[PDB]
Design a protein around this ligand. Structure first.
Ligand code: PC1
Ligand code: 3PE
Ligand code: MYR
Lengths: 56, 177, 122, 459, 171, 79, 128, 70, 155, 55, 65, 87
């Protein structure tokens, strides 16, 4: 229970992080689309764990 | 219809425009190359059959019935080029076509990144402001009394001066900025 | 779908309505008819949290299949035998329903023939 | 309430004794300090109001309006200092003085416990705005706009004075705390019918009601920017506060005397939104949008349910902030191109990108994008009107569709498309205009985190 | 921690894990990793913060309001007694609203917790919700935005007159 | 930058459907002068494209071979 | 033959099907020359004001000001109350108001009559 | 090779405004967040307790957070 | 600007009509004001009510997006006839034929949906059977009462 | 100028290709049975979708 | 390096993309053949369908009268 | 994507297309050879030539500019102006 809800909420927070990253930026971002893509891949893994819990 | 330099469309212009529209729509109906080639030759034969007709009323009636025939057999949606009006990428890059007068409002801190470009811009502006009075004096004496009859502009007659009203059609933005 | 044409294009006195069925007593023509037997307890279906439309007369195979699915993680292809057993018993229940419909159709035909004979004399 | 009145009147010697170049700095600084000080009114209780004295009190309805007024004054000082750049110094000090006097009257209006003192301040607010409009307005018809505004307000409000004096003579007091406990039912007669009309028509004119709204697309248009901000943001809400205070005495005659104005204001918002669809003027379009939103508030107050009251006060605060920001953006465009025509200056996103972002945010809050307090107020009013009757959902849905239509039509016309070729004086956005836009936007977005402080006295 | 009587909850019954297959489930390994990497540092940090909190201790109290006479024993146009009665009635109105909130939270918790068999196992919560909603509707509904104790007294008097007439015509 | 175009003598319409269009028009009595312009699409790497069934059956040989090998391996593995 | 293209309000006749397009008479040629002369004179004025290097502002268009003044500030001076204006005003001004009034009054009367008999289900309604 | 100048409007002033806004927000945002963290960690919240007999609390002793009590 | 360039009232004599035609920059023969029914138009010209999509896209307009020229008389409903709004371009099919075809299609689909609702499809099966009195307690019935026993036999 | 040799396009199309090959099988074998699947039907009703697509 | 564009000719191809396309087409056809060899029931039919005309009236309980 | 253009490539491609035309002898045409006079072509031949060059370069030449394109040099200059080459 303490892993399920933690991983779901951290998937949502992980998705919302790059918006704040680009809003508080001054210089030109170093390959920002790569940063967003890496963030989404990590969020896909992090949200993939609780579905395995639900399937089990 | 709507022309800058002429007040009307001639008969031959109407025939040529009809020929081009009919061939484009026939290409739209006949998507393969060999089939379009065959039917384009048939259409060209039809257009060449009545080429030597001297009766003006008969040629006018032939043109009118040809336009009716084209309107009956047009494609519901013909092939439009991507940059042609009505196309998929028509006026797509208009958001990137920033006019050149916005460079005069740049801060000097970011003007120092391009020294040679801004030097060339300064000498271009010097040339324009030097030539403006000469070109408006040329335009003043070439317009007939009663206003211009068409929208065509004259070139520069003598040596040294630029054609009148040249700045905004030379410094226009590129197609892909 | 021949019964669709027999009810709509044909006559509705022979073909039974599906919305109101059966219209005959279950002892009609069936001496010492027995009931169906429920294997799964009401509490057993209650605490296994089966869907209310899924708690039919063959939920014991469903409970066995769900336990097999839970205990075989992460092997998601581990057991198809319990799924096949549940599906076969579903097929048997569907065959029972088809038998009930055919019985109702034959009883309606027999009643129609009886009234036709009764009109033939009286 | 003397701890806010006295610094406001002390702003007057501050602007009349400052240097020739330091009037804006001093007035803005000290008004921002008093605006920070105004947060002490949030000591509200679940049962009792915050009663200061015999003359002043402030419950949870008047507190958001007070905080909005005291925050709005430095915004008007920042906005109005570019078009008054070349003005005489004495006239500049007179302009700032009229703004200070208007803020003083407004903060004395929302806290008046007696109803006749509320009336006196509510009609003392007429003079500074009329003077501002008719003196510092830019057009010919600012005089006609002032005449229309003044005479609509006074013709609506003189029977209110007569009816309030009648209530004083009949009941014995006009104190709002007394009248909560001494109130009596008002039976059905012709005398009470004209009592209801006399007590209601002043605030129906000031809000405005559809059909009495003819002064608004004039006073909102020929005014300067500070005048338009204070007219859209605060002055329309005096009518809402008046109907919220005065409906207590008008029961149970409201339940059938409110039918014609409910039909006027339900159909009126459709008409004003449709007018917004075909407007050639940006300022007039914003004014008609204000008419539609205040019609929504009129319906919410007239059906008199708790959800309607909470939606009405939230919608009042939200529309004040949004209309002020929209008027500021339109004024910035007017300073750039020296014309109010919406079709003239187009495609400004390629030239002014951050201003285009501010335009997008203001348009998004105009069409009630959740979870903004605009949507909270509009949603609560929609729920209460659905409880009133079911075809109100048809009317509200049509209004929402047309509202989104004209807001995005505003945005697409002004910001998107191909830019105008012959306009070449589009300067980059100043820090002052961007600071003004952000000071309009950030409180509006922050209030969605704690929306309970703008939900009226029956939250 | 909260009070488990106002917010009831049945005892948790979890089944034992039976690994029928030989494939290792990743959930146990992920739980071990979660306890090693996440639970232990958070627990240590909370222990340090609670140690800091235990050095100084101060208390806050729940406000108690004594009962004053209600609006039924107030003279008409007597602002003092009516003021106290109105304040008391408004406080009880707020408390009744939060009681209805408590029962609604109970109902939602039962509906989520019981799973697919919620229609059978949440009968008592539905009955409590129905009773408390009927009481709230009979006490506070249809009063308007200008509700007061006098309006509620008038509504209760009208309902009692209707009940007395109904029991007279049925006698 | 600079690109070199191929030869233009090599675009001959023979062996293409444009030759069929040529003989149909010759039977009628007409000609296509632009036939040599379109002759590139019918020659070279763009000639003799697959049909629809051959497009759906792309890689069917190796898929079938792998299926046969895997089925034989599963047959031997069960014993 | 071919089906004749009938024009509508929302689908205009094409310029290639207009019988007046093929007119060659000298009056129409004179008219087209005059229209081209007006257009060319106005374009010359605009381009003279447009290409000035010493100009930094807005080339004011009197046609746009004329359009806005006609759309806004001429309607009431050029308004005369007659049968058509009064009829349209009574149809579009008091028509919908009366219609919606009767609709809402009937609905609320029906609801209030059903409530007082206890025929309307209001079991869980405590929000209003 | 073949790099062309891209004509764009002056982006200096917009970036300057955004930098000024961020700096002036953070100038008090960072100390307030640090102070709130230090209040929460070291001072801490209050604990609910029953009123002792004969003792009347002050009006600010009915709230939990230290900042709300202040 | 001046007060003699602004619009005015309806012209009656041909002299003021010619003056107005010169004011709006159009020929006197092509200048037609709105009819004088008191709607409030004044002497503003009645242009042929065509959308901007029908203009020539290849012409060099002063305003290219609007397809509008500087100084040209501006239509009364130009903000309605922009390229973002109502189009009046000719269609490949006559308007009446598209209207009747679409209406006939929608009406026929609605009629056949009604007919299919009247005569549905099904399968030759009886009702589904559920144990424990058709799941009386599972469906929310109270246990203190006793339901009528639903008995399903074998077949 | 026909080219498709970019790692981004190839990799994205490859991932969605593997998904469109196996994801239906994996998901339909992993989800729990929330209803009763109808699996007894005549031959012509079983072959309706395939025959219609082939036609 | 990149691919040089060609005029009026078949474009240049990498061996990698041809190999990848052929491999994935072969994978798709192998998967279809494998699943049809194993399941063959989700497409063809799970259980036999009994015709109700062949059921005797005795087991349906039809009284001869 | 989008390889650049030059006057040499434009001239070579336009002469390629005009060389594949059967009605023009390839040993006689040049960059400034006229159509009606120097080559003996009708107006329909000019229209078909313009359509062929539109298909070759993938962009549409309007008729009011197509009637005046009478020699290959003007076609080259029109394409160079429309596509903004040698920048
Ligand atoms: C902006 C334009 C629109 C403005 C609309 C303003 C409101 C419209 C109605 C106003 C009526 C006048 C004030 C009534 C105050 C009533 C107070 C009261 O005690 O009423 C009960 C009293 C009852 O009398 P009493 O209270 O003395 O008697 C004791 C009570 N009985 C009768 C039982 C014995 O009402 C009156 O005395 C008469 C009320 C009606 C007055 C009718 C005349 C005015 C008509 C409307 C004029 C509107 C403005 C026109 C000009 C607009 C601009 C050019
Ligand atoms: C113009 C700009 C746009 C609009 C702005 C707002 C304008 C409208 C504002 C005022 C609207 C009218 C006043 C409110 C009427 C509400 C309904 C009502 O009570 O009507 C009165 C009466 C109803 O009949 P009944 O119930 O029998 O009356 C006996 C009452 N003791 O009704 C009747 O008997 C019929 C009418 C009789 C004459 C009434 C005259 C007095 C009211 C208008 C002043
Ligand atoms: C009687 O016909 C029972 C079947 C259900 C009704 C008819 C369904 C017709 C469509 C399905 C078969 C399509 C065959 C290509």
């Amino acid at each position: 229970m303490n892993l399920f809800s933690s991983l779901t909420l951290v998937t949502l927070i992980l998705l919302t992080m790059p918006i704040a990253a680009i809003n508080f930026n001054t210089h030109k971002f170093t390959n920002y689309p790569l940063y967003v893509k890496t963030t989404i891949s990590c969020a896909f893994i992090t949200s993939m764990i609780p579905t395995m819990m639900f399937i089990h | 219809a709507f022309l800058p330099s002429a007040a009307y469309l001639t008969h031959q212009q109407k025939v040529l425009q009809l020929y081009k529209r009919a061939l484009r729509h026939l290409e739209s109906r006949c998507v393969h190359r060999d089939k379009y080639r065959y039917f384009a030759c048939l259409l060209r034969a039809r257009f060449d059959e009545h080429k030597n007709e001297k009766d003006m009323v008969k040629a006018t009636q032939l043109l009118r019935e040809a336009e009716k025939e084209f309107w009956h057999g047009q494609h519901p949606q013909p092939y439009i080029f991507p940059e042609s009006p009505g196309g998929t990428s028509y006026e797509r890059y208009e958001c990137y076509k920033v006019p050149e007068w916005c460079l005069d409002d740049w801060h000097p801190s970011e003007k120092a990144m391009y020294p040679d470009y801004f030097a060339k811009r300064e000498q271009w502006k010097k040339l324009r402001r030097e030539s403006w009075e000469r070109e408006v004096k040329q335009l003043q004496e070439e317009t007939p009394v009663g206003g211009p009859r068409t929208e065509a502009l004259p070139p520069a007659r003598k040596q040294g001066d630029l054609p009148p009203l040249w700045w905004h059609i030379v410094t226009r933005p590129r197609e892909r900025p | 779908g021949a019964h669709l044409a027999r009810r709509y294009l044909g006559d509705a006195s022979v073909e039974p309505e599906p919305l109101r069925m059966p219209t005959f007593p279950p002892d009609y023509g069936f001496p010492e008819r027995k009931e169906r037997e429920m294997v799964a307890t009401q509490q057993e279906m209650n605490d296994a949290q089966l869907v209310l439309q899924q708690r039919d007369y063959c939920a014991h195979y469903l409970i066995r299949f769900l336990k097999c699915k839970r205990d075989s993680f992460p092997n998601f292809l581990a057991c198809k035998h319990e799924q096949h057993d549940w599906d076969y018993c579903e097929h048997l229940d569907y065959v029972k329903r088809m038998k009930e419909f055919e019985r109702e159709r034959r009883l309606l035909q027999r009643k129609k023939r009886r009234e036709q004979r009764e009109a033939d004399m009286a | 309430m003397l701890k806010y009145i006295i610094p406001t009147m002390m702003l007057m010697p501050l602007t009349w004794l400052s240097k020739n170049s330091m009037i804006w700095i001093n007035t803005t600084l000290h008004s921002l300090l008093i605006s920070l000080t105004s947060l002490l009114l949030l000591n509200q209780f679940g049962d009792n109001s915050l009663n200061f004295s015999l003359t002043f009190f402030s419950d949870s309805l008047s507190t958001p309006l007070l905080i909005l007024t005291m925050w709005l004054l430095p915004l008007m000082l920042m906005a109005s200092q570019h078009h008054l750049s070349k003005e005489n110094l004495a006239r500049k000090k007179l302009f700032i003085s009229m703004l200070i006097l208007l803020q003083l009257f407004l903060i004395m209006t929302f806290t008046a416990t007696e109803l006749i003192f509320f009336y006196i301040m509510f009609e003392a607010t007429l003079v500074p705005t009329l003077i501002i409009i008719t003196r510092w307005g830019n057009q010919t018809e600012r005089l006609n706009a002032g005449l229309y505004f003044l005479f609509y307000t006074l013709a609506g409000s003189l029977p209110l004075l007569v009816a309030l004096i009648y209530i004083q003579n009949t009941m014995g007091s006009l104190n709002f705390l007394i009248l909560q406990y001494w109130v009596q039912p008002m039976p059905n007669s012709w005398s009470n019918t004209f009592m209801w009309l006399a007590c209601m028509m002043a605030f129906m004119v000031k809000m405005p009601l559809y059909g009495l709204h003819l002064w608004l697309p004039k006073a909102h248009v020929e005014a300067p920017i500070a005048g338009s901000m204070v007219l859209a943001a605060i002055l329309l809400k005096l009518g809402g506060y008046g109907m919220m205070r005065i409906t207590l005495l008008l029961n149970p005659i409201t339940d059938f005397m409110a039918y014609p104005f409910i039909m006027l204001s339900l159909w009126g918002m459709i008409m004003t939104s449709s007018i917004c669809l075909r407007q050639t003027d940006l300022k007039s379009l914003i004014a008609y949008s204000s008419v539609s939103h205040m019609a929504l508030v009129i319906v919410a107050i007239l059906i008199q349910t708790p959800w309607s009251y909470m939606g009405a006060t939230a919608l009042m605060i939200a529309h004040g902030l949004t209309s002020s920001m929209l008027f500021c953006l339109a004024n910035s465009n007017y300073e750039r191109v020296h014309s109010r025509t919406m079709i003239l200056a187009r495609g400004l996103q390629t030239l002014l990108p951050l201003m285009a972002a501010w335009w997008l945010l203001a348009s998004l809050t105009n069409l009630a994008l959740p979870p903004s307090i605009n949507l909270i107020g509009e949603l609560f009013v929609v729920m209460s009107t659905f409880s009133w009757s079911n075809i109100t959902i048809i009317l509200m849905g049509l209004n929402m569709v047309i509202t989104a239509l004209y807001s995005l039509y505003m945005l697409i016309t002004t910001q998107r498309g191909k830019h105008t070729h012959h306009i070449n004086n589009i300067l980059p956005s100043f820090t002052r205009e961007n600071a003004l836009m952000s000071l309009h936007m950030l409180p509006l977005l922050l209030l969605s985190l704690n929306p309970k402080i703008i939900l009226g006295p029956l939250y | 921690s909260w009070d488990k009587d106002v917010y009831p909850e049945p005892p948790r019954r979890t089944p034992a894990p039976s690994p029928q297959t030989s494939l290792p489930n990743p959930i146990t390994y992920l739980t071990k990793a979660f306890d090693l990497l996440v639970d232990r540092p958070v627990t240590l940090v909370r222990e340090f913060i609670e140690r800091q909190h235990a050095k100084n201790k101060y208390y806050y109290y729940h406000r108690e309001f004594r009962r004053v006479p209600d609006i039924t024993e107030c003279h008409e146009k007597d602002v003092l007694c009516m003021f106290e009665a109105e304040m008391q009635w408004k406080r009880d109105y707020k408390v009744d609203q939060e009681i209805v909130n408590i029962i609604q939270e109970r109902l939602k918790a039962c509906q989520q917790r019981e799973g697919e068999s919620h229609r059978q196992n949440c009968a008592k919560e539905l009955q409590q919700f129905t009773q408390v909603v009927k009481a709230y509707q009979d006490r506070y509904h249809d009063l308007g935005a200008h509700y007061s104790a006098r309006k509620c007294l008038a509504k209760q008097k009208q309902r009692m007159l209707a009940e007395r007439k109904a029991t007279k015509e049925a006698a | 930058s600079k690109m070199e175009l191929p030869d233009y003598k090599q675009w001959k319409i023979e062996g293409t459907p444009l030759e069929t269009v040529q003989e149909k028009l010759a039977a009628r009595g007409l000609r296509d002068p632009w036939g040599r312009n379109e002759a590139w699409r019918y020659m070279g790497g763009f000639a003799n494209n697959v049909s629809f069934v051959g497009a759906l059956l792309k890689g069917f040989k190796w898929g079938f071979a792998a299926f046969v090998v895997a089925v034989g391996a599963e047959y031997y593995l069960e014993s | 033959s071919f089906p004749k293209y009938e024009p509508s309000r929302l689908a205009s006749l094409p310029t290639t099907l207009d019988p007046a397009e093929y007119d060659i008479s000298s009056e129409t040629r004179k008219a087209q020359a005059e229209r081209l002369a007006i257009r060319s004179r106005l374009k010359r004025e605009y381009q003279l004001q447009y290409n000035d290097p010493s100009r930094r502002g807005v080339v004011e268009d009197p046609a746009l000001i004329r359009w806005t003044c006609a759309r806004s500030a001429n309607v009431y001076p050029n308004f005369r109350p007659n049968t058509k204006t009064s009829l349209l005003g009574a149809l579009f001004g008091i028509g919908p108001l009366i219609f919606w009034y009767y609709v809402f009054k009937t609905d609320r009367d029906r609801k209030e009559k059903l409530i007082q008999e206890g025929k309307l289900d209001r079991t869980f309604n405590i929000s209003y | 090779g073949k790099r062309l100048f891209i004509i764009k409007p002056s982006g200096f002033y917009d970036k300057r405004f955004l930098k000024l806004l961020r700096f002036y927000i953070l100038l008090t945002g960072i100390p307030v967040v640090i102070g709130i963290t230090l209040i929460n960690v070291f001072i801490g919240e209050a604990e609910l307790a029953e009123i002792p007999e004969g003792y009347v609390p002050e009006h600010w002793e009915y709230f939990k957070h230290p900042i709300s009590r202040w | 600007i001046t007060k003699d360039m602004l619009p005015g009232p309806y012209p009656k004599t041909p002299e003021e009509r010619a003056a107005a035609a010169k004011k709006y920059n159009m020929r006197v023969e092509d200048y037609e004001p709105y009819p004088d029914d008191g709607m409030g138009y004044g002497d503003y010209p009645k242009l042929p009510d065509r959308s901007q999509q029908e203009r020539d896209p290849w012409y060099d307009w002063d305003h290219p997006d609007l397809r509008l020229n500087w100084g040209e008389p501006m239509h009364w409903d130009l903000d309605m006839y922009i390229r973002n709004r109502v189009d009046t371009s000719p269609t490949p099919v006559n308007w009446n034929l598209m209207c009747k075809h679409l209406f006939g299609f929608v009406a026929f689909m609605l009629f056949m949906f009604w007919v299919g609702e009247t005569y549905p499809t099904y399968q030759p099966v009886g009702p589904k059977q559920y144990p424990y009195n058709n799941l009386y307690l599972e469906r929310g019935g109270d246990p203190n009462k006793e339901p009528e026993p639903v008995v399903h036999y074998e077949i | 100028n026909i080219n498709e040799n970019n790692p981004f396009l190839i990799n994205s199309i490859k991932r969605l290709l593997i998904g469109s090959l196996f994801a239906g099988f994996i998901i339909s074998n992993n989800i729990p049975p929330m209803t009763i699947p109808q699996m007894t039907m005549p031959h012509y009703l079983k072959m309706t979708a395939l025959t219609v697509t082939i036609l | 390096a990149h691919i040089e564009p060609r005029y009026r000719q078949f474009p240049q191809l990498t061996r990698s993309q041809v190999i990848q396309a052929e491999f994935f087409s072969a994978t798709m056809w192998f998967w279809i053949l494998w699943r049809f060899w194993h399941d063959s029931d989700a497409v063809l039919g799970h259980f036999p369908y009994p015709d109700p005309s062949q059921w005797t009236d005795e087991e349906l309980g039809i009284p001869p009268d | 994507d989008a390889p650049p253009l030059t006057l040499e490539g434009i001239k070579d491609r336009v002469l390629y297309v005009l060389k594949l035309y059967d009605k023009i002898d390839p040993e006689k045409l040049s960059v400034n050879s006229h159509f009606m006079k120097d080559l003996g072509l009708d107006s329909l031949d000019q229209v078909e030539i313009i359509m062929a060059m539109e298909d070759e370069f993938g962009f549409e030449i309007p008729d009011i500019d197509a009637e005046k394109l009478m020699c290959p040099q003007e076609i080259v200059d029109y394409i160079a102006d429309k596509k903004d080459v040698y920048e």
